[PDB]
């Protein structure tokens, strides 16, 4: 019968879904392989042909995904990095491309691009900026107090490392430059970009096991210095809101620090000009150090939960017939 045959095509589909779901269960206990930050929105639709229908992972632009396994050339297995989100099927760049083409063909100018995923560290590295320039006593003493608090508050979960190399250079215009200039600089084994590239791979490796990564980055005084990299940092703005208060603080450190007053005041003003919601992930402008520490810890504990979801319950073997 023609009906009994559609029953076969449906049963084949159900068996394919059962096998895909079984592979999803096996991945629940595998480690996070890598992470990506998205550049586009993906809203799961009814014709997406997901390996298990209804288990597609929808996401917004600039979301973060933890990837555990490659299912096939069209789908990965992973989860949105967000509390309460469980693993499902993430469309690959190959699949994301073909879906956009289908959307444009059914859409209603006279003449009728960007990669959706960037590989980023599995944990977003924490970077402190402000109140002024690093290397001077006011900023160094304030950031050191926050670093000392993070060591104790997150002991056993934290990996703090110093970065003296200018990781602001770790962008495509520098590290992936195709001009005949770079082709010659890559020939010298002592090109300054070698240590920059090496430091980036070390930061990725430090976050692979999902520990909280905190960078003491010497050269990063402004979020625009990392926005073009693939480090996707958590930018913590240590803020002194009153320029006059910052002046007394700098002047209170002696003439050695009062000499470089203008360069410190200018940098603090540059941070104040940043649109806060696009530039900073955490803004610490509390009056007391203890209150600023609690704010930062609250944020990182929430990030820890988003990156360390509880283990899913295993099916009770008592319910099995054999």
């Amino acid at each position: 019968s023609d009906v009994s045959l559609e029953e076969d095509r449906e049963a084949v589909r159900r068996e394919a879904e059962r096998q895909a779901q079984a592979q999803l269960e096996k991945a629940k206990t595998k480690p996070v392989a890598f992470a990506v930050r998205t550049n586009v929105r993906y809203s799961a639709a009814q014709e997406d042909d997901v390996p298990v229908p209804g288990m597609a992972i929808s996401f917004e632009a600039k979301d973060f995904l933890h990837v555990k396994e490659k299912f096939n050339n069209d789908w990965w297995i992973g989860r949105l990095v967000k509390e309460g989100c469980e693993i499902g099927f993430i469309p690959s760049p190959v699949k994301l491309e073909n879906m956009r083409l289908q959307h444009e063909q059914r859409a209603k100018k006279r003449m009728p691009h960007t990669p959706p995923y960037d590989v980023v560290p599995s944990m977003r590295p924490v970077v402190l900026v402000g109140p002024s320039l690093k290397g001077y006593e006011v900023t160094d003493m304030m950031q050191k107090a926050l670093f000392d608090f993070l060591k104790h508050r997150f002991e056993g979960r934290i990996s703090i490392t110093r970065v003296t190399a200018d990781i602001s250079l770790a962008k495509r215009s520098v590290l992936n430059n195709p001009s005949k200039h770079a082709i010659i600089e890559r020939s010298n084994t002592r090109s300054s970009l070698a240590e920059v590239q090496s430091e980036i791979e070390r930061i990725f490796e430090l976050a692979r096991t999902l520990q909280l990564v905190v960078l003491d980055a010497d050269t990063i005084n402004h979020p625009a210095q990392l926005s073009k990299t693939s480090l996707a940092p958590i930018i913590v703005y240590v803020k002194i809101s009153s320029p006059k208060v910052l002046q007394r603080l700098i002047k209170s450190r002696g003439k050695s620090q009062a000499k470089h007053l203008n360069v410190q005041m200018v940098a603090a003003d540059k941070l104040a000009q940043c649109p806060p919601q696009e530039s900073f992930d955490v803004i610490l402008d509390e009056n007391q150090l203890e209150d600023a520490c609690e704010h930062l810890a609250d944020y990182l504990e929430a990030y820890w939960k988003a990156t360390h979801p509880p283990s899913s319950n295993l099916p009770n073997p008592l319910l099995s017939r054999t």
Partner: nanobody
Amino acid sequence: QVQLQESGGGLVQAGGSLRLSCVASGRTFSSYAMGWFRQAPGKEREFVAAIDWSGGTASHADSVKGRFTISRDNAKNTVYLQMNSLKPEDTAVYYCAASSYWSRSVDEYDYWGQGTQVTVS
């Protein structure tokens, strides 16, 4: 995509600065992460370097960090492996492979090239 031609180069004794180059067909090059592998005359294929879709992230093998550097031009559908300071341990056939995934594993790559021979004495 389905066709990967690795221009590359020949062999040297030591030192050296060879810019291997693999060209791809089709306007889906930006949809694939690109990696370089190598197979010594008597050894298994091993990972050398990989670069992601937009070219913003690169990973190099421990045996090759600093000496070799991968890059890509998505306007020319090409990927390179700048090889500097060459050693006998670098004698291998160099393969370039595309993946819809981020990986350093041979099984998780979707398309593979023909291969380019290099030798260091």
